[PDB]
Amino acid sequence: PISPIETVPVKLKPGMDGPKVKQWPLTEEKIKALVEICTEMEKEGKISKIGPENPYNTPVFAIKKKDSTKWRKLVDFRELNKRTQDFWEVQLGIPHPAGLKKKKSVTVLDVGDAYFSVPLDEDFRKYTAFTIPSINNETPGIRYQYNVLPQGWKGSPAIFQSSMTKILEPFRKQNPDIVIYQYMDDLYVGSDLEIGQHRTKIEELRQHLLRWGLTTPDKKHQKEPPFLWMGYELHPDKWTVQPIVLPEKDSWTVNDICKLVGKLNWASQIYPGIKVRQLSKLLRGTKALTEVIPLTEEAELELAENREILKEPVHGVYYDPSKDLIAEIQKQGQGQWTYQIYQEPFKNLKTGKYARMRGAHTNDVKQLTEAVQKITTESIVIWGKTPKFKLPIQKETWETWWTEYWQATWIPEWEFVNTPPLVKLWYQLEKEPIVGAETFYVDGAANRETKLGKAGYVTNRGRQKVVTLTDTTNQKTELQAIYLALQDSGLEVNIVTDSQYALGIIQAQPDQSESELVNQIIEQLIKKEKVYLAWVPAHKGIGGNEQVDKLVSAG
Amino acid sequence: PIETVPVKLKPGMDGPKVKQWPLTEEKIKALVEICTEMEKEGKISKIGPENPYNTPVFAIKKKDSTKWRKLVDFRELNKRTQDFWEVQLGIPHPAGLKKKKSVTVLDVGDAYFSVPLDEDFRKYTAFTIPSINNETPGIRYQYNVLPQGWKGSPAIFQSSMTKILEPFRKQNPDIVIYQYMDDLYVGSDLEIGQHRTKIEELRQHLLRWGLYELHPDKWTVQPIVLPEKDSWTVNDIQKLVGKLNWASQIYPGIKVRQLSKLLRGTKALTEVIPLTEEAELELAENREILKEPVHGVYYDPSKDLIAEIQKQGQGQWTYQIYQEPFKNLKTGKYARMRTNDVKQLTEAVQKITTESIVIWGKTPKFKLPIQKETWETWWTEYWQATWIPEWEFVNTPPLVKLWYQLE
DNA sequence: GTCCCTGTTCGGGCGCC
DNA sequence: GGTTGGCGCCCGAACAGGGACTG
Ligand SMILES: [Mg+2]
């Protein structure tokens, strides 16, 4: 029908008029196909034919859809959307299977011709004018405007989700113990009822829907585990993803790689152990998406690892709010992490990875901090509370670090888990200077003009180096001097630098940086038995940061 | 309750468009309960997408309570609402409220609803309540009455406010009251106990209309300090020359010239240095300068208040307020004995903010020593106010970590 | 102010709906 | 095979800071 519901007022952004766009040419096979569509639609009040007093027009093409060789209308409102008001989008997120509680009876049903069952505000209606092209220049094509929610207009999704809500509210009031998941025109409906009476409640929903102009076709999964919902198969006591198939390709373009990372990420929600960090590195290349990136054999390792995991049967279970939430994290490679959320051992509500590089420099205890933050916010969305954690890090290490780190950092309730590898700090800086060890006063110095710099040191035992760097900078020469000193010191060293920047990076105890130099500095650091790093005011003539500075400033 | 007063967004700005963040079941159950009622009453109306604007909401139990308090983070809208929290606002800041013995913090926002909001301004007040696991789309609301948390609210309910206390005020020429937004700050020098029961007696000069502890003159300033030692080392002197160097921008007279020449050439770090005559009598003097206040630093109510914080560790956080960098209106420590790093630091910004309101009558913008992601995952779990200070996140040098060190 | 360097945000591809 | 909205993962491009410079 047309839903008896009230239109939602719509305006164009102030000062702008409608679209005046030229209907571009289309095959006669579409032009007939569109006339067929635009005739039944006209038959059913969804579109009104308009005269020459509608100034506006926007382009309407057509394309065959999904193995039917049936054409499907489609307007390009890209301009109307530009001129349409802003909206506040109401769809905030996507329902996840694991926030689903086990109900005794389940139904899934979709709403038919949903957008076309909702009235468009009449005063806005005229801006939707489109003309279906006569096979050429020949005829002024048929003019039409839209009476319902057009496909492809900026506003239609929202206004429909909104209307959907506002239509379901009455039923929801009356059936507070019927749970209805509402995604666009998709409905999951669940109850703790015997099918018979459950089934009644459903028809009772479909009658309510029908009274509002919303047809509930029969793509209704009735008494039909597996239900197919939001991408998943739902069985009565377990859920799963509908089958994933990674493109087995010969010559990967970059965008082919983004398509591969995509399926892996989606798989990563129920297949524990999915690794993607190696493949989301091949991407680090300001790019033509067309460009063909050669498969790194390290990625090669990864993909192989994954393609293998994918052959495994996995499933999740559903949420019991009686019980607690429990997350287990796993350090599973260089800044690749994995977790599972459960309420009983080996029964996985879901899983997931973290593998983000936040910072140019980071370490394990940061990342395992980041990944716990991620899992917190995710859990709030799906279950509306935060899980208990079980982490592969010993209280020891945490406190060593919550101590040396100078920006507040935190993790909740968490039990140690000896699921090795354990998260360790790879080296530690001394807190006080190392008695009797060699003391390197380092500095470096660049030349903003020639980009030429010097880095070097001067030491208490009497030795000094100066080294010249082409195409460098002050912060790299600072970092050079500290690596130079590291290279040349025994197993225990003291380093005095005037660089607030160098001090900053290293005091944070990196074990991983996008910078090869900071990585060269890290490999050394891991090799010493003790390192003390002291700072001093540059150019203030401290002994002997002034000699290092005097030798090093030939830049 | 009748007809209303015209408002406008600062000449050129557009309404708020901020996303709603995920909320816990409890904060949501609380919220639809609260908003169901304000719907029945007609303080909030239900709206849809046609309203392009949004502001975040969560809810807090203001303390150990079952009563949940709705908090709409109007931070943005307030920032965008026309200049009249200074321009049409009449309030001078009674300089002496900070001088009182006791001050009590009074929540009174639920008294703002009495007053209609301009018909054309309602839309900016829009906010969206989430559903958990996204079982439904967001449910959208708008305001028809002065909103709690909005800065235009007390700047309107003021004439009335100035009235509501005409008696109680006259009848108490030595108890001072101040209205900063949702909260009402009233305190007197009276004894510990007859103060409590004099505030309680304002609830009645209130309740007939409708509808925690904190002692001000004891937030003691925290000094900048130098380690005294019987024996010094190269490393000890180099840290000393490092601090005083810096401090020498906050205090003009601080000299380090005699100490820097004990570092004559390339000594090893742990070598001991015999402090010389002028040496010891330069830092002896320097430690005198650090006693005296900063001279010539004055609050500009026009300008922006800036708090800045450092984690010292051991539950001790040091802070400065300041408007021109280095001219700190105040400096302090939030000492906690012996531990949630994030609860700690969120509480630190509430204690400070209050002081700011109490002393200057506005709130700082904070520069926080925490990573955005981290602050944002957890901070609403420990918030307790009705105002929210602006903030931004900082990546501090470990040096300033080291310029407020005690021992 | 100019360099850097770091941290954000913002689009844009992909995934899924 | 030319259209819309959502969330997620990535990347880089744009920014905003902060420190260090400069004659
Ligand atoms: Mg230097």
A141 and A1 in a common domain: yes
Q: DSSP letters of B251-266? A: STT---TTTTTSS-S-
Q: How many Å separate Cα A183 from the centre of its chain?
A: 20
Task: Give which of A29, A215, A536, A509 is closest to B239, Cα–Cα.
Answer: A536
What region, left, alpha or beta, does residue A283 occupy, with left being phi > 0 and alpha being psi -120 to 50 degrees?
alpha
CB-count exposure of residue A379 (10 Å: 0-12, 13-18, 19+): buried
Residue A311 neighbours by CB under 8 Å, 6+ apart: none
What's the CA gap between A91 and A49, in Å, rounded? 33
Lookup: tokens for A369? 């901090």
Structure tokens at A148: 């319902």
Neighbours of B170 (CB within 10 A): 8
A114-151 burial, b at 16+ Cβ within 10 Å, e below that, comes to bbbbbbbeeebbbbbbbbbbeeeeeeebbbbbbbbbbe
- Helix, strand, coil: what percent of chain A each, to 5? 30, 25, 50
Q: Which residues contact A385 (CB under 8 A, 6 or more apart)?
A: A325, A379, B24, B25, B26
Query: What is the rounded (10 degree) CA torsion for B251, B252, B254, B258?
Result: 160
| AA identity, residue B219 | W
User: How many residue pairs bridge chain A and chain B with CB atoms within 8 Å of each other?
Assistant: 208
Return contacts of B251-259, CB within 8 angstroms, 24+ apart. B251/B289, B251/B290, B251/B292, B251/B294, B253/B289, B254/B286, B254/B289, B254/B290, B255/B282, B255/B286, B256/A540, B256/B282, B256/B286, B257/B282, B258/B282, B259/B283
C-alpha R_g of chain B: 25
Write the CATH number for A40: 3.10.10.10
**For residue A22, is it left (φ>0), alpha (ψ between -120 and 50) or beta?**
beta
* Residue A69 and residue A7 share a domain: yes
C-alpha A186/C-alpha A488 separation (Å) is 67
Domain identity same for A138 and A3: yes
A26 and A57 co-located in one domain: yes
In terms of phi and psi (left: phi > 0; alpha: psi -120 to 50; beta: otherwise), the region of B176 is: beta
Top residue of B29, B269, B371 to mutate, by most chain A CBs within 10 Å, is B269
Q: Which residues of B304-338 are buried (b: 16+ CB within 10 A; e: fewer)?
A: ebbbbbbbbbebbbbbbbbbeeeebbbbbbbeeee
Q: Helix (H, G, I), strand (E, B), or coil: what is residue A504?
A: helix
Q: Do domains B89-112+154-216 and B322-403 have the same CATH topology?
A: yes
Q: Which residues of B73-95 are buried (b: 16+ CB within 10 A; e: fewer)?
A: bbbbbbebbeeebeeeeebebee
- B270 contact residues in A (CB cutoff 8 A): 433-436
| A476 CA: nearest nucleotide by C1' | C4
Write out the residue range of the structural domain in which residue A211 sits: 91-115+157-225
Q: A464 CB contacts (<8 Å, ≥6 apart)? A: A456, A457, A458, A547, A548, A551
**Burial classification of residue B228, based on how many CB atoms lie within 10 Å of its CB (0-12 exposed, 13-18 middle, 19 or more buried):** exposed
Put simply, whether A185 touches B (Cβ < 8 Å) is: no
**What is the DSSP secondary structure assignment for residue B348, as one 8-state letter?**
H
Distance from CA of A117 to the nearest CA of B (A): 18
Sign of dihedral through CA atoms A393, A394, A398, A403? Answer: negative
Contact at 8 Å (CB) between B50 and A8?
yes
Cite the beta strand spans of B149-302 per DSSP E: 176-180, 183-187, 232-233, 272-273
A503 chain-B contacts, CB cut-off 8 A: 397-399
> CA A160 → CA A417, B125, B138, distances in Å?
48, 23, 12
**SS3 (DSSP) at B319:** strand
B378 in reach of chain A (CB within 8 A): yes
Count CA atoms closer than 13 A to B86's CA, side-chain side.
13
Cα A210 from Cα A379, distance rounded (Å): 36
Contact B189, B177 (CB under 8 A): no
Nearest to B332 by CA among B352, B312, B353, B306: B352
Supply the DSSP string of A304-331, one letter for each residue. Answer: HHHHHHTTS---B----TTS--EEEEEE
Contact A503, A541 (CB under 8 A): no
Burial of A322 (C-beta count, 10 Å sphere; 0-12/13-18/19+)? exposed
Nearest nucleotide relative to B373: CA against C1' = C8
In which region does residue B381 sit, left (phi positive, over 0), alpha (psi from -120 to 50) or beta (all else)? alpha
Q: Are A458 and A498 in contact (CB under 8 A)?
A: no
Residues 321-340 of B with CB under 8 A from A: 340
Name the residue closest to the C1' of C15 by its CA. A262
Is residue B384 less than 8 Å (CB to CB) from chain A? no
Beta carbons within 10 angstroms of residue B102's beta carbon: 20
How many Å lie between the alpha carbon of A409 and the closest alpha carbon of chain B?
Answer: 6
Question: Helix (H, G, I), strand (E, B), or coil: what is residue B279?
Answer: helix
The answer to whether B258 and B278 have CB atoms below 8 angstroms apart is yes
Contact B266 A535 (CB under 8 A): no
By C1' distance from the Cα of A281, the closest nucleotide is D10
Integer Cα distance of A345 and A328 in angstroms: 10
How crowded is the C-beta side of B33, counted as CA atoms within 13 Å? 12
Count up the domains in chain A and report the number. 5
Judge if A126 and A200 occupy the same domain.
Answer: no
For B395, nearest residue in chain A (alpha carbons): A407
Residues in chain B with CB shorter than 8 Å from the CB of A544 are: 263, 265-267
Sequence-distant contacts of A130-135: CB under 8 A, at least 24 apart: A130/A23, A130/A57, A130/A58, A130/A59, A130/A60, A130/A75, A131/A23, A131/A57, A131/A60, A132/A23, A132/A31, A132/A34, A132/A35, A132/A38, A132/A60, A133/A23, A133/A24, A133/A25, A133/A26, A133/A31, A134/A31, A135/A28, A135/A31
CA distance B59 to B77: 18
What does the alpha-carbon distance between residue A486 and residue A18 come to, in Å, rounded to a whole number?
68
Q: In what order do the strands lie in the sheet with A142-146?
A: A47-49, A142-146, A130-132
Interface membership of B345 toward A (CB under 8 Å): yes
Kindly report the bases of strand C lying within 7 A of a protein C-beta atom. Answer: 3-9, 13-17
A15 and A104 in a single domain? The answer is: no
Kind plus residue range of the DSSP H or E element containing A35: helix A28-43
Query: Which of B245, B344, B370 lies closest to A537 in CB terms?
Result: B245
Quick one: CA torsion of A199, A200, A203, A205, rounded to 10 degrees? -100
CB burial class (10 A; 0-12, 13-18, 19+) of residue A239?
A: buried
| Of A198, A225, A252, the domain-final residue | A225
Element (H, E) at A131: strand A130-132
Helix A156-174 to helix A195-210 angle, to the nearest 10 degrees? Answer: 130
CA A358 distance to own-chain centroid: 14
Q: In chain B, where are the structural domains located?
A: 1-88+113-153, 89-112+154-216, 217-321, 322-403
Nearest to A441 by CA among A368, A546, A360, A512: A546
Residues A103/A181, Cβ–Cβ less than 8 Å: no
Question: Which of the 27-86 residues on chain A come under 7 Å of nucleic strand D at their beta carbon?
Answer: 27, 30, 61-64, 74-78, 81
What is the phi/psi pair of residue B378, to 5°?
Answer: -120, -10
Q: Cα(A118)–Cα(A5) distance, rounded to whole angstroms?
A: 7
Rounded CA separation A271/A352 (Å)? 8
- Terminal alpha carbon distance of chain B: 60
Calpha distance B98→B216 (Å, rounded): 6
CB of A182 within 8 Å of a chain B CB? The answer is yes
**Chain B 171-200, CB below 8 Å of chain A: which residues?**
none
Distance A293 CA to D11 C1' (A): 14
Please name the member of B50, B233, B342 whose beta carbon is closest to the beta carbon of A408: B342
- Please identify, among A319, A341, A364, the residue that sits at the C-terminal boundary of a domain: A319
- Crossing angle of helices A297-309 and A254-267, in 10° steps, is 40
Q: How far apart are CA A296 and CA A302, in angstroms?
A: 10
B266 contacts in chain A (CB < 8 Å): 439, 441, 458-460, 543-544, 547
A134 and A58 in a single domain? The answer is yes
Cα distance from B265 to chain A (closest Cα, Å)? 4
Which residues in chain A are followed by a discontinuity, with C-to-N distance exceeding 2.5 angstroms? none
Describe chain B by its helix, strand, coil percentages, rounded to 5: 30, 20, 50
The DSSP secondary-structure symbol of A277 reads T
Q: Cα–Cα distance between A434 and B270 in angstroms, integer? A: 7
- CA–CA dist A184, A202 (Å, integer): 18
Which of the 8 DSSP states describes residue A359? S
How far, in Å, are A35, A72, A388, B14 from residue A134 at the CA level? 10, 18, 65, 45
Resolution number, Å = 2.9
**The pair of three-digit structure tokens given for residue A165, joined into one six-digit string:** 């809500």
Q: How far is the CA of B248 from the centre of ligand 1 (A)?
A: 20
CATH topology of domain B322-403: Alpha-Beta Plaits (3.30.70)
A288 touches strand D (CB under 7 A): no
Distance A509 CA to ligand 1 centre (A): 21
D21 C1' – B398 CA distance, angstroms? 21
CATH number attached to the domain at B1-88+113-153: 3.10.10.10
Q: By the CB < 8 Å criterion, does B366 face chain A?
A: no
Binary contact (A535, B242; C-beta < 8 A): yes
Please tell me the distance from the alpha carbon of residue A116 to that of residue B189, in angstroms, as a whole number: 70
Taking a C-beta distance cutoff of 8 angstroms, is the pair A357, A345 a contact?
Answer: no
- A72 min Cα distance to partner chain B (Å): 28
Instruction: At A400, list the tokens.
Output: 């060593």
- Plot region of B7 (φ>0 → left; ψ -120 to 50 → alpha; else → beta): beta
Nearest to B24 among A100, A384, A434 (CB): A384
How remote is the CA of residue A77 from the centroid of ligand 1, in Å?
Answer: 59
Same domain, A331 and A314: no
Instruction: Return the number of other C-beta atoms located less than 10 Å from residue A413's C-beta.
Output: 9
Sign of the C-alpha dihedral, residues A261, A263, A264, A265?
A: positive
A497 Cα–ligand 1 center, Å? 7
Residues A176, A64 share a domain? no
Q: What is the dihedral of CA A336, A342, A346, A348, to 10 degrees?
A: -70
Are A152 and A266 found together in one domain?
A: no
Give dist(CA A59, CA A74) in Å, integer.
9
3-state secondary structure of B242: helix
Instruction: Residue count of chain A, please give it.
Output: 555
Q: Is A277 on the interface with B (CB under 8 A)?
A: no
Same-domain pairing of A314 and A463: no
CA distances from B396 to A4, A527, B238 (A): 60, 28, 21
Closest Cβ opposite residue B264 in set A437, A537, A543: A543
Q: Which residues of B114-123 are buried (b: 16+ CB within 10 A; e: fewer)?
A: ebbbeeebbe
Helix (H) or strand (E) holding A57: none
| Contact call for residues A19 and A150 (beta carbons, < 8 A) | no
CA distances from B299 to B252, B302, B349, B364 (A): 20, 9, 20, 12
The H-or-E segment that residue B331 falls in is: strand B328-335
Distance between CA atoms of residues A323 and A343, nearest Å: 7
Tell whether omega for the bond before A544 is within 30 degrees of 0, i.e. cis. yes
- Helix ranges (H only) for B53-94 are 75-80
Residue ending a domain, among A319, A344, A371, is A319
Q: Which CATH superfamily includes the segment(s) B217-321?
A: Reverse transcriptase/Diguanylate cyclase domain (3.30.70.270)
CATH of the domain at A230: 3.30.70.270
The counts of H helices and E strands in chain A are 12, 24
Integer CA distances (angstroms), B138 to A160, B47, B143, in order: 12, 11, 17
Between A89, A95, A408, which is nearest B369 by CB?
A: A408
In the DSSP assignment, the letter for residue A12 is B
Per-residue tokens: A544: 């002997």
SS3 for A204?
A: helix
Query: Is any Cβ of chain B less than 8 angstroms from the Cβ of A85?
Result: yes
Task: Answer yes or no: are the C-beta atoms of A376 and A389 closer than 8 Å.
Answer: no
d(CA B65, CA B61): 6
Backbone CA torsion sign across A42, A45, A46, A50: positive
Q: Near strand C (CB < 7 A), which residues?
A: A 94, 183-184, 186, 229-231, 242, 244, 255, 258-259, 261-263, 265-266, 289, 358-361, 448, 451, 473, 475-476, 501, 505, 515; B 371-373, 393, 395
Q: Does the annotation place B73 within a ligand binding site?
A: no
For residue A475, report the distance from its CA to the centre of ligand 1, in Å: 9
Residues A324 and A393 in one domain: yes
A96 touches strand D (CB under 7 A): no
Regarding the domain delimited by B89-112+154-216, which CATH topology (the fold level of the hierarchy) does it fall under? Alpha-Beta Plaits (3.30.70)
**Which of A95, A158, A369 has the CB atom closest to B49's CB atom?**
A158
Under DSSP, is residue A266 helix (H, G, I), strand (E, B) or coil? helix
Q: Tell whether A95 lies on the interface with B, counting CB pairs under 8 A.
A: yes
Gaps in chain B (C to N distance exceeding 2.5 A) after: 211, 338
**Nearest CA among A132, A157, A124 for reference residue A59:** A132
For chain B, give me the number of helices (H) and strands (E)?
Answer: 9, 15
Q: What's the distance, CA A39 to chain centroid?
A: 42
Distance, in Å, from the CA atom of A436 to the CA atom of A439, rounded to the nearest integer, reads: 9
Least CA distance to A438: which residue of chain B? B268
